Amino acid sequence: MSTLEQTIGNTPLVKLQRMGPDNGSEVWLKLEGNNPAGSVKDRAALSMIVEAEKRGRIKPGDVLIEATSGNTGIALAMIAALKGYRMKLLMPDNMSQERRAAMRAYGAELILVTKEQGMEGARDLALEMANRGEGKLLDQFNNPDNPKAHYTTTGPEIWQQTGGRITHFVSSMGTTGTITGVSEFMREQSKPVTIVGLQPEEGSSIPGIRRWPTEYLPGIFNASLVDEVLDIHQRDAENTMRELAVREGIFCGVSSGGAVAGALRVAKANPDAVVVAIICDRGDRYLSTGVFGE
Template identity: 70%
Template sequence: MNYPTIEDFVGNTPLVKLQRLSTDSSDTILVKLEGNNPAGSVKDRPAMSMIQRAEKRGHIKPGDTLIEATSGNTGIALAMAAAIKGYHMILIMPDNLSVERRSSMRAYGAELILVTREQGMEGARDLALEMQQKGKGKVLDQFSNLDNPQAHYESTGPEIWRDTHGKITHFVSAMGTTGTIMGTSRYLKEQNPDIQVVGVQPAEGASIPGIRRWPEEYLPKIFERSRVDREMDITQEEAEDTTRRLATEEGIFSGISSGGAVAAALKLSQEVENAVIVAIICDRGDRYLSTGVFPAE
């Protein structure tokens, strides 16, 4: 008998209806629980995709050293995928991100290199490319790797279309690498061009883990602005408050960028009627316990 392996359970995550946060609306707000993936986030999908497809092309092989700049979830997912596939994983991330994320990466056997908060993700990305140039490993580069959005085109988008029976009217996703929104938008708009795609970014001055307002020179190469109908700014307070409310009112223990996506979905719901809005819950809240977003006692 052939039994499934852990990678067989990446994807096909639950799509559930919000019951209490959206009671005053004629809309249906659904959230896709990507924290149910094996390594706990939406990034499991592109992590497996990037490694599997690079193997098929002959670009990498088990035993190689892989390098990636990450704000957290991609790093954890790649650390898991590297453990499954037999790679040495070097992850580069800013030192101000939560200790839970660092610990999770190390638990899978990854090597961590920290850059300063001031260097940020831009500095982490530059260092990854510099290390590759020096022959220290191969960069997967989630920011320009088309296998990132392709994973969502082949899985996230079809799952949402299937589970809403084609009734989705709006798709809401936080934007970091933009892989989720690019691939999902492409698939959904092929099914129905009228579906509205909303990208969520932090308001000026907000620091929301996992989503960014990229300087133009660091804008992910996979990003195509034409695939996003609207961008919504969410404040730090809105993202964190909605994250807490998801836990206490819906029983959904999520990360802060997920709170931002749902906050945007709730705002959108005030503008439209009889809509079916789908938002991505991209990870779990246990990665943020040390950040102070949840009550300690």
């Protein structure tokens, strides 16, 4: 039997037991939590490191550098352990300690920056380090190796678990590799599939995703892939997520109970509606932050 890395992907697709409207419009869950490192990110991290062991770029024994909100942090830490890389991650210091700790536990080098510096500052600091000789920068935000994972794996999966049937795909936007990569695959399907994407409102802190300031716009984005972009409230992200285990037994991050929000908006909108919503990790690395009770 099988290797941890071949335990990444082929994730379950589960329809909403009870929640939301019912007007013929069905909603199915992409369960990325199940990934060995517990998030959607593992697909991209694998892709990224093995695609670049392939173009001869990186090689075991090497140090790798990434700036993270955590998940990709925890992701590349894992795979590295599996293949004998050393990792440093760059993260801001307002993210949770469960995020801190899982990255450390996998034996990666963790560097925290100010929250006032936040994600864009950790990117800036990432670039410098590498261009000073402190390691190789894989750059999930501009690496087309990240959306390739979804476009290769995620996308073809969603289609065959809905057969040839999905009408909508709702995705929470961070890196944007998921939406973009899943969008590539679907464009080619000789039927129409509407890819919807979600961003925090004005002042809406939700971990996993961002509306990226202008000069930090992910190179991998591609507006022609994204039909609509929806705006998601931080409280309606925590409200639906909590609604989701209580009412569905699906135990998820806020990013996920958010994407179900939009997904429900779509269904609540379109009847006849097969709407696959991305759930990114689980509820556990959010537990100690008071979001799931206190």
